[model samples]
Target: VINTFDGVADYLQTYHKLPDNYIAKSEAQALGWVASKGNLADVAPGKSIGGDIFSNREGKLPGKSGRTWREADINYTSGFRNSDRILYSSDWLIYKTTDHYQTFTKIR
Candidate 1:
């Protein structure tokens, strides 16, 4: 469970590469993904649920020490279905929040 997030984070931290699931917004746009629509999979089959940078602009997250953070579309909260994401960096810092970014849980 957590290992999957751990693995994905480590892969990014080590190789500076995203896992098999993530796709940059630029690339996804080529597939016609529209974020507001939550309709990524509609245009790109087998390539939805992943993506671009996460600013983390509120100075909320730690490790602003030159490590760049990016966002990966992971899951959606239940009932309301507000989209959730795994905000991680090019290092082993991984976090998640399903409640519309109201909170976050560090995984690694």
Candidate 2:
């Protein structure tokens, strides 16, 4: 659920947030999700890692005072994690990055 770029982007556009299927990285870690191993599937099964605050330290996305962003993995499978991800702002501006935050495309 909500794994694809359009699927998650559309969900954010309509709901202004990630779906319930998404789990915070810390929460997933508690459930045995190791980032290096990408063991989310081994731990939470159908859940996807999401809802954690994105620092935007790279200053890649558009910024404004008091605007915050969150992120979620896209198209993740078992084993090592890929680069695909969706980043959404506090105001619901959504963007997708397939290169592990190296680049991005606005989706909503």
Candidate 3:
């Protein structure tokens, strides 16, 4: 069941899981996701892939010592998004990419 990045960080390190079509960006912007038009299944119906908030601000990992690195958007299967992602860090580290974040591999 290892679909990479340690199986989505071991299902978010056991229970912080996000399996049935991830959605966050404020819960897909209160069910009206505005990442520009494709509308996240017009608001939530097999919703638009993973949660957001990977604002590493170009520091690019190694958590400058904490609180920064949490993303998930791999294979959204639509036309408004899909930069294939899954960077994680809550003391543990996980990463993956499909030509989206340029480069990444440290899966653990």
Count clashing residue pairs per candidate: 0, 0, 0
Candidate 1 residue-wise lDDT, 1-108, digit = tens = 112455656666677666675667788778876667777656655453455767777766676578877776654211222456677766657787665566888876
Candidate 2 residue lDDT tens string, 23-95? 8988988888777876778999888878899999989999999999899999876677788899999988999
Q: In model 3, where do residues sit more than 4 Å from their true spots?
A: 1-11, 19-37, 45-47, 50-79, 87-93
Give each model's whole-structure lDDT. Answer: 0.62, 0.87, 0.69
Evaluated against the true structure, the overall lDDT of model 3 is 0.69
- How many clashing residue pairs, candidate 3? 0
User: How much does candidate 2 score in TM-score?
Assistant: 0.92
Q: Per-residue lDDT of 1-108 in model 3, one digit per residue for the tens?
A: 223455667887776665666767787887777776877767676654565667767666676665657778765655587666888776557778777877878877
> Which numbered prediction scores highest in lDDT against the true structure?
2
Residue pairs clashing, model 3: none
For candidate 2, the lDDT comes to 0.87
Q: Highest TM-score: which candidate?
A: 2
TM-score of each: 0.69, 0.92, 0.32
- Name the 10 consecutive residues with the lowest summed lDDT in model 2: 75-84
